[PDB]
């Protein structure tokens, strides 16, 4: 599923992402936007280390979810990576929350540092009623 901007902003809000661990909704929208273009089916195989990124947040299989084919990987969110390919983003949100409870916070995703940090992200939630 490819979410429409405001539809997604409210979906995230309903799920408790607004200010979760100090992270604003616009920061989460910016992350989803640059990670998958709001596409829940997005996937990226990293031939270099044999891992795969799944879903709207492009969560990596090496540490966060189990796909059974990533060498010596762990499953910190305790979820099948398949859970990250559902149209319903609740499990993906639960996993994204788990990622940010770690030391780096939102900085866990290099794309956020690259395209959201110290950027004006107002545009992501404008007029969404969030």
Curated annotation (Swiss-Prot):
Catalytic residues of the enzyme: 35, 53
Main location: secreted
Family listed: Belongs to the glycosyl hydrolase 22 family.
Keywords: Amyloid, Amyloidosis, Antimicrobial, Bacteriolytic enzyme, Disease variant, Disulfide bond, Glycosidase, Hydrolase, Secreted, Signal
Molecular-function annotations in GO: identical protein binding; lysozyme activity
CDD domains membership: LYZ_C (cd16897)
Domain of life according to the entry: Eukaryota
Localization, UniProt: Secreted
Record-annotated C-type lysozyme domain positions: 1-130
Classification of source organism: Eukaryota, Metazoa, Chordata, Craniata, Vertebrata
Physiological role: Lysozymes have primarily a bacteriolytic function; those in tissues and body fluids are associated with the monocyte-macrophage system and enhance the activity of immunoagents.
Catalytic reaction annotation: Hydrolysis of (1->4)-beta-linkages between N-acetylmuramic acid and N-acetyl-D-glucosamine residues in a peptidoglycan and between N-acetyl-D-glucosamine residues in chitodextrins
EC number per UniProt: 3.2.1.17
Annotated disulfide bonds: 6-128, 30-116, 65-81, 77-95
GO biological process: antimicrobial humoral response; defense response to bacterium; defense response to Gram-negative bacterium; defense response to Gram-positive bacterium; inflammatory response; killing of cells of another organism
SUBUNIT field: Monomer.
Recorded GO CC terms: azurophil granule lumen; extracellular exosome; extracellular region; extracellular space; specific granule lumen; tertiary granule lumen
Clinical note on disease: Amyloidosis, hereditary systemic 5: A form of hereditary systemic amyloidosis, a disorder characterized by amyloid deposition in multiple tissues resulting in a wide clinical spectrum. AMYLD5 primarily affects the viscera, and the predominant clinical features are renal dysfunction of varying severity, and intra-abdominal bleeding. Inheritance is autosomal dominant.
Pfam families with a match to the protein in the record: Lys
Further comment found in the protein's record: Lysozyme C is capable of both hydrolysis and transglycosylation; it also shows a slight esterase activity. It acts rapidly on both peptide-substituted and unsubstituted peptidoglycan, and slowly on chitin oligosaccharides.
Name the record gives this protein: Lysozyme C
